[PDB]
Design a protein around this ligand. Structure first.
Ligand code: B12
Ligand code: B12
Ligand SMILES: C[C@H]1O[C@@H](n2cnc3c(N)ncnc32)[C@H](O)[C@@H]1O
Ligand SMILES: C[C@H]1O[C@@H](n2cnc3c(N)ncnc32)[C@H](O)[C@@H]1O
Lengths: 517, 256, 257, 517
């Protein structure tokens, strides 16, 4: 194959084999278990929405009722469809009745499973058609405007109130941002529920709610029509509500969203088993909806030695790619992430960063790879920070990274001002315009520093992946192979939310989205 | 102007001594134009710039303009009589706390935190202890020289103290959120009583946490300080290491 | 905490939210780096009106110099509605601005003929204005795209100066005089003006003096179209010539014999 | 030969042939003529220094006396030696006598030329030995402290007062500057004399006087001992006193000196005959003294279209190189200069700048090439200016330029502050450390944008050189081939100072320095 790093393609094939075997062994467990959030997402996809008098979302009410009073191992679809056939009520009003305490889903005489499957099928099909139409609409917009071929400038807005987030995002879009991500409220990965309605308050950012997605997409469509270029919307899905937020994004036509398999286990202490089970359904929904899936490999290198931990990032990327493939996500929707996170005082550090970026670009040739700015070694010196961002952009343009999270020269002191964002966008535009075709011109010396560095990182990643495969994925996470953090397989939050599937368990949406279209 | 340096009249420095060349940059919420430039120059003139000149101005949006201004400051500072405010104390950085622990303490700071009683509320202690922390302030277990153990939401006090003894905890973190019928203070007093009965109230820092608990309440109940809703992980780490070095308490690894 | 509603009578800076007043400073103090220097920088920034200045960055440029970067919320407000634009913006045009002006308002290249007439030998003054490196980075009229500069020499008699101006079709004439012994410059400039008047071509052309002892009042008294003193650069002269050739329609001597 | 640009080495050889033929044709005129400044330099090298009661330098007094009262075509050495034989006084005392009017060099009876040559030979040999000693002293310092492999950071300091310039230069050296150039007082190239004594005030810089050179070299030697690394000193020589300032630099041990051949003609309107005769002796002195000679091709691209005028810079560089070789300057002392002056809004502009820099490096493999920063398109946006400086440094290290005139983010608004210079030095050091070995790693695509651009510029330069060779250098200058400025052959300043050599013309220093060692 064609490679500027003279990669050992046999070694890459071996690493991919190891990652696929790891993911297959993990999948042997995933397909036999479900979680509370998966059932709640099944409730949402059937039209259940809203909150009871106490503010608990109706999917939460229904699912916890079925779990406490019945057998959740049969799936929320079974009980909802049984109630639908028994009483004839639409699922939303069934949920309302259950919330009011008038209807008890478990006391109804259970009908034959085939009739329940028929009863829920039309609603499932209509929801799937809605998601498919949303994908088709995004494709139509992108065809109408003819999106760019260069890197997409990715920015962030975190005012904490949605009605101000719309204004800030529109301003950033007019400034030149191609992808706009609204920072989810801090520590929302630890919530076992998705708040309801538009949120006018939040610490660190706005909560990820369906109404917020609707507001934001409408607002960004206005500016997309104004500017004549499609502007993408991004949000976070990780943590204890992954399938639910994925469903909300699919229904509201989000264009990108952070969906990392291992983030919850490593950086939020979510239970090892629950995260793996619900990530499958979240990624199935995202892949069917046509959403690009970003990964959080940048967390690995923060506060760590980026020179000694590159192979861990590569192994995580390979495992995440395989976990996405088993869910049906095309490679064109795998925004695997990595960061320009090496020490600025390291001699030839730019060569090593270029080698790693080119290696990632080579291994995943179709992926819309996401490249992230330096944060660990940023300081109060805004000018040297601007120079570091310039070098980061230089690497981005040289290695043909698709998505480009813009760095801010004031990253180390505060959230960016509007002026800082404008300066960063201007610098990125300047560098991407001056070096538009540099990636095609530049090649690397055979056996040079860059090729040797790439080969070294690849060898280390292959060894780590082989060791993990020998150990098992859960055992490897327990041993601390990733991010030097040890996670007991029975520890973490949400272990009580995992239920083994009954033989009669059924979920229409898995079949509808994996096999259809 | 006189180019001799006077330490009673210290002034900024450009390319000549005793000038005032200083640089500004700010965004005004006004449309770009001559009127915006005049507004910027008048605003910088009130700050004390003698000859403010708008080096650069460009519209960020239809109603925002970004400026860069250079001017000769008129103000001066009496450097010779200036006194250093020693009261300025701040939470240590991550690596600063790591090197502090490595220098003043041989061991790794073993921290065992858990919500106790019947509380299901854990987003606070998880904000303190989890790697990603809270709003960019990474938690205690992200620290290289800290062995953080999180036991979960509904941990009975007996289990909490048992785990602390088993792990050899140098410090204990307890989070209480639900204050109905003052159930939090009752459980905290029970925890302190149990530790004192076990005879290991010393040997461990005993920090409190929650949204409706304050340092005064913690000290009233017998805890080593208590952190309210505004706390981050670095605050807790700085306190846990500083108070541990000050009062030389031995972790429970020496308790049989 | 502060009101976020915009008020054009009390316009503050804007860092991330309305009326926060965030501004960024950076300056060098002639002070050894340390806590004392940081406190001095903070105290100095407080005098400028910053509420809670924080020294984002400080690093010693030398054993006796420190460089600071500071962020703070400004207390001061500017009344944007009452701002009045002024016509006192008499900034001298840049090179490209002058070229565009000449292209737009004139369909020709401005012919400029300069010389140190008389017996005076000093020519560095006029070369500072007419030659391409110019003076202190201010490139001379010769580097201008739309100007045909013709520097003649150092001791050209006024007759030769006028003859060359007629030959080239000069739009403007620059004469440099520095030696003021016995008012020789006065006599020489008066003689040049008299010669132009006798030739009948005092009009159709601009006349500009120059030198260390030449002032606008003296030039106007002598009968010239202004005169530039020791503080002048090439952009000043270019702007004056270009503006005055449009304010007054000057038919350059190309149409003359 | 080895080239990353796949240069047409036959075309390069043809261009060098054309440039050498141009210089050879000009040398026919140069060899048969001298100027007043050359004679004043001969006077200075014989020990004549000081000023008379009116402040006129004694070399000026002596040469003016010889020209007005006698026949300067015989050289100043002839008359000085005749005076030494007749009166027995040293040349300095003879100059003082002439200044006082007590002696008349032309009325003295003329001794045989052989006696004249013998009388002058001892002083000439002593001065040449002094210059050799200065060169060997510089070599000893460089050997003692070692010379860095990377680019030399070149900074400019000037305040009009020498006793403050020493402080500024020492501070800059401590900050990290490797070469310090004291910006000469502006328009000094038009003076027909070199002022005397230390300068306490000046406009746009500090005058170039021998005392200033001595003071600066002493201060920089002190700082070099402090820092343990040799700090070089640079100044300007161009214009009506080129040989004199070159002699002063050789005697005061300057390390670098701007000695562009064509600068005086094009940008200061100095008559081409005088400039061409002066530069020969100036470059002979500089080459003998071991001084690196910079050239001012950066002036070509200022205010001009750098994309359209790239070939003119290369042609000027080739002509300047061929003019230095005829003067005996080794290729290791030819600091040919070029600038990073392309439009920052030009797509692929960085590729074109990289192509031109690499082409210049490849054509002149041994030269300590000087690379200059962008100034035409620098604006008041200091942050984008810093990014442009970062890209300029990137090119510098990617193409292995030796001398690197640091750019300043505030270049467009004022002379740099100390803080601005520190920031520039910091960014340059950061980029040079992170990309230490990038030049070895990268090679360029065959037939790509960079190679095609290099070939295009080379072809254009060859055609321009062929035209100039057909015309002759003087006619080509008259027709505005360079910097689109037309220069009459008999016009300009200093034409009266050129005198045709007598058959018995005598100048010992030409032989001693050109044929020595
Ligand atoms: C999320 C939430 C829940 C979730 C928590 C999920 C989880 N995974 O932990 C769940 C669903 C469990 C829940 C349940 C209930 N809740 Co609730 N819940 C909330 C909510 C919306 C946010 C709380 C939160 O996590 N805040 C975010 C964290 C980061 O803030 P934090 O606690 O302040 O933590 C910071 C600091 O205090 C400090 N910190 C905290 N602990 C510690 C510990 C240490 C050692 C240190 C150093 C620092 C520290 O640092 C942290 C970071 O800065 C609040 C309302 C609100 N917005 O405040 C109600 C609220 C706390 N809940 C309330 C109630 C009553 C209940 C229920 C009883 C309701 C019911 N009908 O049954 C139940 C069950 C009670 C129980 N058994 O615990 C009331 C309590 C009122 C009272 N006077 O006690 C509140 C105030 C709502 C209200 N206004 O009525 N709730
Ligand atoms: C250099 C110099 C010379 C040189 C000039 C070399 C040359 N190529 O031109 C030479 C050697 C020829 C010279 C000679 C003499 N000099 Co003389 N010289 C000086 C000196 C040191 C600097 C003058 C200079 O060029 N300044 C630099 C230029 C850039 O400044 P500038 O003239 O002000 O030009 C600026 C402006 O005035 C304006 N400008 C100037 N011309 C023009 C023209 C136009 C059209 C415009 C728009 C603007 C403009 O813009 C320029 C750029 O900003 C001065 C002292 C001083 N430092 O001031 C004495 C000085 C001018 N000279 C003086 C004298 C007397 C003489 C001599 C007569 C002395 C003698 N014993 O013979 C001789 C002979 C002169 C003659 N033959 O007519 C006196 C004049 C005193 C007086 N009362 O008039 C001075 C002031 C010295 C003194 N203090 O005694 N000198
Ligand atoms: C305590 C806070 O948490 C929410 N809330 C209350 N009970 C639950 C529950 N069982 N599950 C999820 N959210 C709940 C409401 O917002 C309430 O105010
Ligand atoms: C006119 C000014 O120029 C200098 N000066 C005077 N006559 C000459 C000359 N012939 N040549 C060079 N410099 C001269 C002196 O500095 C004087 O002050």
């Amino acid at each position: 194959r064609e490679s500027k790093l003279n990669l050992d393609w046999e070694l890459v094939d071996k690493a991919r084999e190891a990652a696929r075997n790891i993911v297959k062994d993990t999948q042997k467990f995933i397909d036999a278990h479900t979680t509370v959030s998966v059932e709640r997402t099944v409730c949402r996809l059937l039209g259940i929405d809203g909150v009871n008098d106490l503010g608990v979302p109706l999917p939460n009410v229904v699912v916890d009722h079925i779990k406490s009073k019945g057998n959740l191992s049969l799936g929320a679809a079974t009980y909802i469809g049984n109630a639908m056939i028994y009483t004839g009520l639409s699922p939303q009003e069934i949920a309302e009745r259950v919330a009011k305490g008038e209807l008890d889903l478990t006391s109804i005489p259970m009908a034959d499973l085939f009739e329940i499957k028929l009863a829920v099928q039309d609603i499932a099909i209509k929801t799937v058609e809605k998601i498919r139409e949303n994908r088709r609409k995004r494709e139509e917009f992108l065809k109408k405007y003819g999106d760019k071929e260069g890197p997409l400038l990715y920015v962030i807005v975190a005012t904490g109130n949605i009605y101000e987030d719309v204004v800030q995002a529109q301003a950033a879009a007019r400034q030149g941002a191609d992808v706009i991500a609204v920072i989810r409220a801090t520590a929302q990965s630890l919530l076992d529920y998705v708040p309801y309605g538009p949120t006018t308050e939040g610490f660190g950012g706005t909560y990820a709610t369906q109404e917020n997605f609707r507001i934001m997409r409408k607002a960004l469509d206005e500016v997309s029509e104004e500017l004549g270029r499609y502007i993408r919307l991004c949000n976070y899905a990780s943590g204890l509500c992954m399938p639910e937020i994925a469903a909300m994004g699919a229904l509201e036509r989000l264009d990108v969203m952070l969906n990392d398999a291992l983030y919850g286990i490593l950086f939020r202490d979510i239970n090892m088993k629950r995260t793996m089970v619900d990530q499958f359904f979240s990624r199935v929904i995202n892949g069917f909806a046509g959403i690009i899936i970003n990964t959080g490999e940048d967390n690995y290198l923060t506060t760590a030695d980026a020179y000694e931990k590159a192979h861990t990032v590569l192994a995580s990327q390979l495992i995440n790619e395989q976990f996405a493939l088993i869910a049906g996500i095309p490679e064109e929707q795998m925004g695997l992430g990595h960061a320009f996170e090496m020490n600025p005082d390291l001699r030839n550090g730019f060569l090593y960063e270029l080698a790693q970026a080119q290696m990632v670009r080579e291994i995943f040739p179709k992926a819309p790879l996401k490249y992230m700015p330096p944060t660990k070694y940023m300081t109060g010196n805004i000018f040297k920070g601007h120079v570091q961002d310039a070098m980061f952009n230089v690497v981005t343009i040289m290695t043909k990274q698709r998505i480009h999270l813009l760095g801010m020269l004031t990253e180390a002191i505060h959230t960016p001002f509007m002026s800082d964002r404008a300066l960063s966008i201007e610098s990125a535009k300047y560098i991407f315009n001056n070096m538009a075709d540099i990636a095609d011109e530049i090649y690397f010396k055979e056996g040079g520093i860059i090729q040797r560095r790439a080969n070294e990182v690849l060898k280390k990643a292959y060894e780590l992946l082989k060791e993990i495969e020998q150990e098992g994925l859960f055992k490897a996470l327990e041993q601390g192979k990733f991010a030097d953090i040890k996670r007991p397989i029975d520890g973490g939050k949400g272990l009580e939310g995992v239920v083994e599937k009954d033989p009669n368990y059924f979920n229409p949406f898995i079949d509808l989205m994996l096999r259809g279209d | 102007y006189d180019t001799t340096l006077d330490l009673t009249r210290v002034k900024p420095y450009g390319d000549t001594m005793n000038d005032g060349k200083v640089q500004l940059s700010f965004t005004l919420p006004v449309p770009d134009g001559a009127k915006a430039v005049e507004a910027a120059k008048q605003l910088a003139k009130k700050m004390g710039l003698e000859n403010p000149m708008v080096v650069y101005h460009a519209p960020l949006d239809k109603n925002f303009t970004f400026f860069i201004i250079y001017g000769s400051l008129i103000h001066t500072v009496d450097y010779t009589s200036i006194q250093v405010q020693e009261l300025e104390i701040k939470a240590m950085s991550m690596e600063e706390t790591n090197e502090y622990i490595k220098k003043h303490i041989g061991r790794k700071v073993v921290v065992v935190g858990a919500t106790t009683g019947t509380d299901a509320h854990t987003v606070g202690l998880d904000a303190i202890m989890n790697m990603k922390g809270y709003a960019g302030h990474y938690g205690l277990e992200r620290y290289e020289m800290i062995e953080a153990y999180n036991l979960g939401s509904q941990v009975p006090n007996e289990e909490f103290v048992k785990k602390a003894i088993e792990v050899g905890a140098d410090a204990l973190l307890v989070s209480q959120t639900v204050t109905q019928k003052d159930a939090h203070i009752k459980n905290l007093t029970h925890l302190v009583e149990l530790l004192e009965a076990e005879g290991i109230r010393d040997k461990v820092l005993l920090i409190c946490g929650g949204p409706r608990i304050t340092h005064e309440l913690a000290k009233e109940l017998g805890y080593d300080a208590g952190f309210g809703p505004g706390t981050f992980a670095d605050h807790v780490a700085t306190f846990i290491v500083t108070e541990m070095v000050k009062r030389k308490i031995p972790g429970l690894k020496g308790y049989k």
